[PDB]
Design a protein around this nucleic acid. Structure first.
Lengths: 196, 156
DNA sequence: TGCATCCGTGAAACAGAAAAATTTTCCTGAATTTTGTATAAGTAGCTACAAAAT
DNA sequence: ATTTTGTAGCTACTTATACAAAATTCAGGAAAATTTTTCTGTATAATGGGAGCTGTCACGGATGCA
C-alpha cells in the first residue's frame, strides 16, 4: 500500500527493486526518464492495479531504464517478486492476472496512441482531454469533467507547449465552449456536443 | 516534584498494602492522577548520576566513561562524506560551469543552502525567466542513469 | 646536635502562593508561485506549388 | 510525367518575454493560555557528630632536645 505525495517519483532507472507493483489508489503516473531530459509520464493508474514491469523485461536483470513518479499522493501496493515469479510460475490465471494488469498499462499506451502525437496541439490536447475526463474525471453538472489541481505546462508535456495550456485552453474555457476552471479546476462540459 | 514523588511513594505503598509490590500503576494512576508514563519518568527523573569514574567493577582496573566517545565522529564517516563533496563536484562540475555556480548558489556545495532564486537570479547576471528552468535542467541533467547513477552508490 | 617522630611516597513539605515561563493561536503578511497574461516578434513550421527524373 | 525537387512563398502558427497579479503558501508573532516553576510559612518545645583506624617509608627533619 506504498505511496508518496503530489510531487514525488517512484524510482529511477538503475534501481533493481523492479517487481510488478499494485497502485492501490491515485494515478502515481510514472515519468519514463530520458538522457538529457523530458520525461513522459506515460503511466497512470487506478485502484488496486499494477505498474513498473521490471523483473520481467531483461529477466530479473532488467534496468528500469525509466525513472518513475509518485504523481499524485500515491497509493500503490506491491508484492514479493515470487508473486510474479514463483506464484506466477504456477497456473496461467496467476500470470494472466498480472498480464491483465499489464494489458491495462498496455491499453493505456493504445489510449495515448493516436490521441498523442496526433498533429495539432489543440485537437490533440482534447483528443485525450475527454479521455482524461474518462479516467480521473469528475462528472458534475456541466458534464463529465476532471477536476485535479494542475499546471499549464505539465500540460506542455501534453504537447511541447509554452503558454497553450493557459492560452488555448482559455478558449475551450470560454471563447470555445468545452470546460471551465475554479482557480485550478477542469469542467469538461461534455463528451462531444459543443466543441465536440 | 520531589514532594509529589515522595507523596506517590507513600500513596503507592498504601496501594502495595492491598496490592503487594503495588504492581498497579495506571490503577495506581486512579490514585496517581497520571499515566505511569510520568510515574516511570519520575523514577528516572529521581536518579542520582554516577561518578564518571567509579572504578569499573569485577575489576578495580579502571574508571567508567572510558568505554565511550565524545560528540565527535569516526573518520570513516568524515571521509565518506568528503568524498561526496568532490565526487559530486566534478560530476556536477562537467555541465554548464556558469549554471554549476547557481547549483552551489541557490543550493549548497559551500555554505548557503540557498540563495533564494530571487536573490540568486540577479546574483549571477540579474534574471527571472532563466532560473528554475536551468535549475530542473541541471537536476534532470545530472539525474537519470550514467549521471545520477554516480551517487546511486554514494547516496551520502 | 644526632636523634625522637614523623609527614605521606613511591611503589526529607506544603500550601499557599504567585510568576513566570511557554506555548498554542494568530496572524499575518509577507513573501513568494503560478499563471495568466499578456506580449512580439519572428517562424519554422506549414501548407501548394512547378517543372523536370521516377 | 510524376515526383521530387523549388522557390519563392505566404499564411497560420507557435514559441519567447516579460509582467503580473494574483495565488498561495509560510513564518513569526503574538498571544494567550497554561503549565511549571518559585516563594513563604509553620507556633507546645526541641540546644554539640561519627568513626575506629590501628602492619612500609623517609626523609628530611627533627625541631627539639635533654
Amino acid at each position: 500500500v506504498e505511496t508518496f505525495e503530489r510531487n514525488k517519483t517512484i524510482f529511477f532507472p538503475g534501481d533493481p527493486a523492479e517487481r510488478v507493483y499494485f497502485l492501490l489508489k491515485g494515478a502515481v503516473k510514472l515519468s519514463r526518464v530520458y538522457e538529457a531530459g523530458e520525461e513522459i509520464t506515460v503511466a497512470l493508474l487506478r485502484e488496486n492495479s499494477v505498474f513498473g514491469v521490471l523483473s520481467l523485461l531483461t529477466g530479473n536483470k532488467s534496468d528500469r531504464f525509466y525513472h518513475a513518479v509518485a504523481f499524485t499522493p500515491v497509493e500503490l501496493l506491491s508484492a514479493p517478486i515470487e508473486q510474479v515469479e514463483q506464484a506466477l510460475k504456477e497456473n496461467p490465471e496467476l500470470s494472466m492476472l498480472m498480464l491483465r494488469g499489464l494489458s491495462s498499462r498496455i491499453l493505456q499506451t493504445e489510449m495515448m496512441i493516436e490521441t498523442l502525437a496526433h498533429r495539432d496541439m489543440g485537437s490533440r490536447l482534447v483528443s485525450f482531454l475527454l479521455i482524461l475526463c474518462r479516467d480521473f474525471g469528475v462528472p458534475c453538472a456541466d458534464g463529465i469533467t476532471i477536476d485535479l489541481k494542475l499546471s499549464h505546462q505539465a500540460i506542455a508535456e501534453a504537447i511541447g507547449s509554452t503558454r497553450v495550456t493557459v492560452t488555448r485552453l482559455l478558449g475551450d474555457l470560454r471563447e470555445k465552449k468545452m470546460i471551465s476552471i475554479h482557480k485550478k479546476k477542469i469542467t469538461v462540459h461534455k463528451p462531444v456536443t459543443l466543441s465536440r | 516534584l520531589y514532594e509529589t514523588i515522595s507523596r506517590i511513594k507513600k500513596t503507592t505503598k498504601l496501594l502495595s498494602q492491598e496490592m503487594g509490590r503495588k504492581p498497579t500503576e495506571e490503577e495506581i494512576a486512579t490514585r496517581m492522577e497520571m499515566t505511569i508514563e510520568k510515574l516511570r519518568f519520575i523514577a528516572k527523573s529521581a536518579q542520582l548520576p554516577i561518578s564518571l569514574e567509579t572504578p569499573i567493577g569485577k575489576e578495580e582496573d579502571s574508571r567508567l566513561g572510558d568505554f565511550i566517545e565524545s560528540d565527535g565522529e569516526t573518520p570513516e564517516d568524515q571521509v565518506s562524506k568528503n568524498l561526496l563533496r568532490e565526487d559530486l563536484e566534478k560530476v556536477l562540475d562537467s555541465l554548464s560551469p556558469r549554471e554549476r555556480d547557481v547549483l552551489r548558489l541557490r543550493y549548497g556545495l559551500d555554505d548557503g543552502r540557498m540563495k533564494t532564486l530571487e536573490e540568486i537570479g540577479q546574483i549571477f547576471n540579474v534574471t527571472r525567466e532563466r532560473i528554475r528552468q536551468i535549475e530542473a535542467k541541471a537536476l534532470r541533467k545530472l539525474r537519470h542513469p550514467n549521471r545520477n547513477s554516480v551517487l546511486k552508490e554514494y547516496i551520502r
